[PDB]
Amino acid sequence: PDYYEKPFNPDGVTPGSYKGISQIDPYWAMPQLTAGSTADPSSEHFYE
Amino acid sequence: PDFWIISGKKYHRSHLVVVRGPQPPDILKPTYIFGGIPLTQRIYERVY
């Protein structure tokens, strides 16, 4: 029910699950940040 | 500088890999904060 919410795991691919590729305009999406993203510049995931 | 301070975490120079552009003379190094002389500084006026 929440596969996309969990981090990606390649081992979870079931046969026939792949359907296609969808593209979304920027105004239909809204990014979100967490504590880890804005923790410290030493982190490799700073401001994404 | 043998040590760099990043958000209160203390790092020794040997661990880091620091690269800089043109090298200023020693008396001018503190003014540039021990760094290379930035290219925008010589290009912005002519670009304008």
Q: Which amino acid is at A23?
A: Q
Q: Which residues contact B24 (CB under 8 A, 6 or more apart)?
A: B31, B32, B36, B37
Q: Which residue has the tokens 């691919």?
A: A13
| Residue A38 distance to chain B (closest CA, Å) | 12
Q: After which residues is chain A broken (C to N over 2.5 A)?
A: none
- Chain B interface, mutation test: which of A40, A43, A47, most B Cβ atoms within 10 Å? A40
Asked if A41 is an interface residue toward chain B (Cβ–Cβ < 8 A), one would say: yes
Matching residue, tokens 């290219």: B39
State the virtual CA torsion across B45, B46, B47, B48 in degrees, nearest 10: 50
Distance between first and last Cα of chain B: 35
Please name the amino acid found at residue B11. Y
B4 contacts B11 by C-beta, under 8 angstroms: yes
Q: How far is A42 from chain B (nearest CA, A)?
A: 7
Query: What distance, in Å, lies between the first and last C-alpha atoms of chain A?
Result: 26
| CA proximity to B15, closest of B23, B4, B26 | B4
The percent of chain B in helix, strand and coil, each rounded to the nearest 5, is 25, 15, 60
**Torsion sign (Cα): A6, A10, A13, A19:** positive
* Structure's resolution in angstroms: 3.1
